[PDB]
Design a protein around this nucleic acid. Structure first.
Ligand code: GDP
Ligand code: PHE
Lengths: 85, 82, 61, 205, 366
RNA sequence: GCCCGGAUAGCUCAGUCGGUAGAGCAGGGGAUUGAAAAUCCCCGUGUCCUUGGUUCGAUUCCGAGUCCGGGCACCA
RNA sequence: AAUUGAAGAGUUUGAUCAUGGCUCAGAUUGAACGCUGGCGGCAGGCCUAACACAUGCAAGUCGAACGGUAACAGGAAGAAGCUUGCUUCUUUGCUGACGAGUGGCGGACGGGUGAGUAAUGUCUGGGAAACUGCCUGAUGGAGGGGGAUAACUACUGGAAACGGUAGCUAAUACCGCAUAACGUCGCAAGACCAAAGAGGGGGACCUUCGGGCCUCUUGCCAUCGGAUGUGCCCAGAUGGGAUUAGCUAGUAGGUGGGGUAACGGCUCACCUAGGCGACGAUCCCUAGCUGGUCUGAGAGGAUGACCAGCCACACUGGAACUGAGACACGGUCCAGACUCCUACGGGAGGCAGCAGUGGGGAAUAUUGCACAAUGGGCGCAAGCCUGAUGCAGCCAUGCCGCGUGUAUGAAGAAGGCCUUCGGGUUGUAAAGUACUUUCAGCGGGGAGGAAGGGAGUAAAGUUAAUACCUUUGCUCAUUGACGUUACCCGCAGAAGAAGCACCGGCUAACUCCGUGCCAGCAGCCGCGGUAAUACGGAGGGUGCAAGCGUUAAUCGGAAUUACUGGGCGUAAAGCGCACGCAGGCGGUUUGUUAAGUCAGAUGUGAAAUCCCCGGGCUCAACCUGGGAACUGCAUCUGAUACUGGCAA
């Protein structure tokens, strides 16, 4: 529609594909610890968890994730790795 | 957001102004928390015509309320000191 | 069906009109009156009384 | 809003004088009073109970020169008062300014004073009021505009007032064309020949 | 819509009259082509503004013919060289005079088809004598030759003769008087249900002036109501002030399509009232001149043509004259079937069945 | 504004390819009666919408206008 | 001071009293029709098609964020006329400012509609498993680098829309690093996570001569708060039909994982067999809810336009991204219908935003003016945008004010009408006569709505500083759509201004002529059959008034749904009779609980409206201050009669 406020539409799409690149990267690491926890390797899982720790909290700090999701993904996952340990 | 702005009620050509404490994202005659006094620029040269519960105004000031230009000038005109 | 109240009218086969309610108590089955002075319903001629009814204009001179 | 027609006819219907056409003549007698309002006046009205209600209602209305819309509102403005409606109703009827100047004598008759008021000739508390239905407050003073003072009409009016009531609920000087109004009219001090009891009962159905 | 019109040049409304296949539609495009270097087209000159009227030259379309005659200050008589004095061309001189055209430009067309000056001068003479029989100084009318088709294709020789046409258009045809101080009057000719603006009525301003935001009222055979001139467009060109003589459009104050039709009259508030009874002075024409072949009678109902209309009315002949033969010079009372503003001195035409039988002139209103 | 159909006594229609307008349903006018139904005695109230023409001659032939219903436009 | 409040009559029958329907007298309305029509103030003005939509407008803004400057206006260098600085004129981002672009913010508010929705909604009252940009309070940090890209260029596809290829550059845009706390995770140890710089001015000092440096203002990053907004949860209330009686299988619940800001069948896997239901589930039809408005003595009944709170929707259906906030009116993507452009491959659009047009309909209006005021967004600010709002046009649609003149006036006429032709009546009515002038029309005066803002200047804090910044005064010019204003004065002449229903009873007010159960009247009983108080006309009279009637519509009269406040032998109405579950109700004594109830208190019951007392528009309507009420719900502390629970 003819409005100079259509600038938000193009700013949305450039911010769209960018957020997909960040979130898919964020969710990729979460799947990584799941594979490690399923092999019974409590050390590798502890290792992989240490990898995504500075990642998910680097995402909540910028304003992307609402920090409670970041907390929970770590929280239960914290109790998950020591459940095997 | 919160603010201590006015709210123009009254008849046509004979305006009235009611200083009200409300969320700034609401209409002029919209919802509000409370009205704190009023203002009549077309009343008369009688005994009254303007009342502002200065204390409640200042109570919201510490809370974070923004006083609008019209009433801020009106506050100093009603003599806070005198 | 509707009653056409008045002394002399010109409604024939079509002449779209206006209908105001009200029973008449004479003809069985009719509860409507045709408004005089609307769409095609002309005013009743020779009227000097009750012209608010029958759609009659006030005498000129 | 007014009758502005054969105004003396209304006094013939009720069979009583209402001071509607007083003028310079004290007693009329040339109106054929108490005999014929209209053409079939020789007949006799039956006066049903509802009929005596309506005739009593109008009696006071022709004198106070008001109409039903304003009359019924005066009743409602009388209905929301304490005590008694009837006595308070005659207070609001006499509350009109045109009644006061008539009681003052500035205006010769009822309708005449209305014209006097509506022609910006009367002033009260320094404010000229054109509204005839001005509710007069107790303890105040009315006056006449300087430019519209004594134009031969008010002169004839005051001399007529010497042969009337000149109520006690107001004080007139008649020397400086300035009169003051005291407290509201009392029931024991007014006409009393008229009835307001039925007017209260008529509007209760 | 846009583009406000500049009121700098005088607006003289002219039009073409004649017969079928003389070069009518061809010349309409020819005028606007060279100057740039019923349907209407316009053309503007650096000295004045001229409106052009193209009317159909067929007998059955007399309804469109008379409506086109209402905007004729200077008739452009286009006569083909291969045809000459045609009956309707003769009738256009007749009915043109019945509405009152003062000056007429005679244009000899299709001169490219016949190179013979002898007969072209003779066809000119035939038109000259045709004007003389209808009280027109045919010997004082500037004769201009020309070719319609070739001038439109770009033949500069025939195109330059269009300048001679425009030359006589500025000399033989002067700017008429505009009674602007007199009460505004306007012949309603066409109605346009403009999508988005409502109902638009068009016409040529007879008297007074007009301007956007002016209260107007419509008088005529239909009961008179109130309206408002809310928009003055002239071929999609807005105008702030239209004076008398202007061929503009007036936007109404929201009326429906089927109320205000061809026949009424837009006028200035409370100025001109309608009339139901009047007497006229007539000049009954002959069968060869255009009238009937049999004398009509009392009660006979022909149509009356004034300014736009073809309104029917009963002819009230004076008692005694029951047989009015073709060629009579009498006066009779006229009872119209519908009330309409009748001014004494109004020149009109008495027609019926597709022919003009009499030349009406309103004598007195009864 | 253009293209068609009905415009036939109160009502529905016939009659027509030039020859002095019909029928049915009506209804109405009289005697009997307080007033009628019922019975009987008599029965058409019409500018074939209007105006005009080709005329010894037009309901019907050809033209127009106006009224109603049915289809198309046009877009200062 | 704050509810001082309630009418009936006509009609069944030969007549009466009953029962019982029917109808009218009242009030009101988002009104419509007919007739009439002078002015003004305040409101209302698409209820039907949530029908389709031409065109303009309805949300943009910031250079004190950045690269740039395509244009406009200057400076400077230069250059040509030529009066040698009077002009002409080519460069130049060096300034004021500024199209297009990057970025931040707004666009989720404001505005409109009521289609959908019978409980996922709303209202009342409690509640905890949450979040919250802008604003404000407290303590801190703000150290150091890198990599692209739009605009701009070269070229190029396409009718346009709209792109494509290869290069150029900056930042509060982006991505690391450093550094971490009462922040997050964890039993703990420990582990882990942030960012941005600009603007004004200036002494010393310093100038790779951009600037560093000092200071003031502004903005940014982290955490706990507050306030506001928002999401969510339980209980109760919130339509009709039982000719709808069984219904549900993520359905009821548990453990574990996942998912959301948050609890949760919100969603999955396994397991169990439950959950809802006559104090109404599912099903069917209708409908936005509430504060309120109208009616009514109240209780209730109807209803939910305008103002306000809330929810839902945005051509239709659907999904999701962005973002603090939407799963979105002037945003996107996909399918479909309807329009539209087309160079026929392919694209564009959504008035239930102001107006406006067609169409529907009995019916509802201008394609107006200004951002002066209030409110909102951006900005330090000045300002900019603002169809919100403020006003105007139009309309008797409603309420309220007012005028169409006042006084005098008897041949007590003319004309009209009735008549016992005597006369009466029209009728002090008019005329004649004497005065005044509202509102209209004309011409001049003239408020207030205006608070502030810009420049200049003084004092005091700020600072190294008389500078800059900021706070408070003083001064100049002022910022007004309405607007030919409200109001005031002057001028002229009664000069410009009254109709409508009815007139037999209900229900105020009559005769005459004419038509003869014909024409017509009507709300009901009914009038009219050749003397009509009821038809039509004439006069007179009556009700009301710029309104008067009619019709639709709700309530009232209707105690004809009766809780307040009705009935059941014969008038409509006792199941043919009985047993009996759930349910309703219960003798008498004490104790006890304090549930209901009762007393007082608390929070709350939004505002407005309504009731009272005052104030301000010439008065009124209207606007409006304080108060009361909001007849209610929840909690706490007491009372123990009556009711209910347990025990004897
Ligand atoms: N050759 C030729 N033909 C002509 C000329 N002028 C007009 N015409 C013809 O006239 C014809 C139609 O002319 P027009 O006036 O438009 O007729 P209308 O509009 O139907 O009455 C066209 O076919 C032209 O060929 C001319 O100058 N030369
Ligand atoms: C509209 O353009 C009118 N001014 C002229 C016109 C043109 C064509 C048809 C009718 C009127």
């Amino acid at each position: 529609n003819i409005k100079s406020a259509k600038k938000r539409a193009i700013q949305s799409e450039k911010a769209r594909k960018h957020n997909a690149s960040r979130r898919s990267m964020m969710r990729t690491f979460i799947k990584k610890v799941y594979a490690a926890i399923e092999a019974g390797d409590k050390a590798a899982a502890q290792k992989a968890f240490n990898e995504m720790q500075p990642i998910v909290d680097r995402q909540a700090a910028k304003g992307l994730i609402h920090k409670n999701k970041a907390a929970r993904h770590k929280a239960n996952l914290t109790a998950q790795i020591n459940k095997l340990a | 957001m919160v603010t201590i702005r006015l709210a123009r009620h009254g008849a046509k050509k004979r305006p009235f102004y009611q200083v009200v404490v409300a969320d700034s994202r609401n209409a002029r005659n919209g919802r509000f928390i409370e009205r704190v006094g009023f203002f009549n620029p077309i009343a008369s040269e009688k005994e009254e015509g303007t009342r502002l519960d200065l204390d409640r105004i200042a109570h919201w000031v510490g809370q974070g309320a923004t006083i609008s230009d019209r009433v801020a000038a009106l506050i100093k005109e009603v003599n806070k000191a005198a | 069906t509707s009653y056409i109240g008045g002394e002399g009218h010109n409604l024939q086969e079509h002449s779209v009109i206006l209908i105001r309610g009200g029973r008449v108590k004479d003809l069985p089955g009719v509860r409507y009156h045709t408004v005089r002075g609307a769409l095609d319903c002309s005013g009743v001629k020779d009227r000097k009384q009750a012209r608010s009814k029958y759609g009659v204009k006030r005498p000129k001179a | 809003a007014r009758y502005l027609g054969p105004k003396l006819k209304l006094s013939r219907r009720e069979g009583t004088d209402l001071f509607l056409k007083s003028g310079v003549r004290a007693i009329d007698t040339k109106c054929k009073i108490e005999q014929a309002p209209g053409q079939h006046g020789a007949r006799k009205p039956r006066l049903s109970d509802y009929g005596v209600q309506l005739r009593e209602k109008q009696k006071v209305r022709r004198i106070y020169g008001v109409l039903e819309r304003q009359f019924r509102n005066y009743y409602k403005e009388a209905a929301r008062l304490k005590g008694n409606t009837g006595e308070n109703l005659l207070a609001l009827l006499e509350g009109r300014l045109d009644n006061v100047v008539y009681r003052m004598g500035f205006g010769a008759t009822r309708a005449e004073a209305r014209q006097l008021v509506s022609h910006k000739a009367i002033m009260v508390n320094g404010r000229v009021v054109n509204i005839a239905s001005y509710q007069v407050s107790p303890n105040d003073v009315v006056s006449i505009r300087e430019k519209a003072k004594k134009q031969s009409r008010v002169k004839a009016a005051l001399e007529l007032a010497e042969q009337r009531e000149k109520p006690t609920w107001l004080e007139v000087d008649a020397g400086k064309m300035e009169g003051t109004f005291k407290r509201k009219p009392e029931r024991s001090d007014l006409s009393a020949d008229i009835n307001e009891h039925l007017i209260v009962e008529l509007y209760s159905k | 819509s846009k583009e406000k019109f500049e009121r700098t040049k005088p607006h003289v409304n002219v039009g073409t009259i004649g017969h079928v296949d003389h070069g009518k539609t061809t010349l309409t495009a020819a005028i606007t082509t060279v100057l740039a270097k019923t349907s209407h087209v316009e053309y503007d000159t650096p000295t004045r503004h001229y409106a052009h009227v193209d009317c159909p030259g067929h007998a059955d379309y007399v309804k469109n013919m008379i409506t086109g005659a209402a905007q004729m200050d200077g008739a452009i008589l286009v006569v083909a060289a291969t045809d000459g004095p045609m009956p309707q061309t003769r009738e256009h001189i007749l009915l043109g005079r019945q509405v009152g055209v003062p000056y007429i430009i005679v244009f000899l067309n299709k001169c490219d088809m016949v190179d013979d000056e002898e007969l072209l001068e003779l066809v000119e003479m035939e038109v000259r004598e045709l004007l003389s029989q209808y009280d027109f100084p045919g010997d004082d009318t500037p004769i201009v030759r020309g070719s319609a088709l070739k001038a439109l294709e770009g033949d500069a020789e025939w195109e330059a003769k269009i300048l001679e046409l425009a030359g006589f258009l500025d000399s033989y045809i002067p700017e008429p008087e505009r009674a602007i101080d007199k009460p505004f009057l306007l012949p309603i000719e066409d109605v346009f249900s403009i999508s988005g603006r409502g109902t638009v009525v068009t016409g040529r301003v007879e008297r007074g002036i007009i301007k956007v935001g002016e209260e107007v009222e419509i008088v005529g055979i239909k009961e008179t109501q109130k309206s408002t001139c809310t928009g003055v467009e002239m071929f999609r060109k807005l105008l702030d002030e239209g004076r008398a003589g202007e061929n503009v459009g007036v936007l109404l104050r929201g009326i429906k399509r089927e109320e205000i039709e061809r026949g009424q009259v837009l006028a200035k508030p409370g100025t001109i009232k309608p009339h139901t009874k009047f007497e006229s002075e007539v000049y009954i024409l002959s069968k060869d001149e255009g009238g009937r072949h049999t004398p009509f009678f009392k009660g006979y109902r022909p149509q009356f043509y004034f300014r736009t209309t073809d309104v029917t009315g009963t002819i009230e002949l004076p008692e005694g004259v029951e047989m009015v033969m073709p060629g009579d010079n009498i006066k009779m009372v006229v009872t119209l079937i519908h009330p309409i503003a009748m001014d004494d001195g109004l020149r009109f035409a008495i027609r019926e069945g597709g022919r003009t039988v009499g030349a009406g002139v309103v004598a007195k209103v009864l």
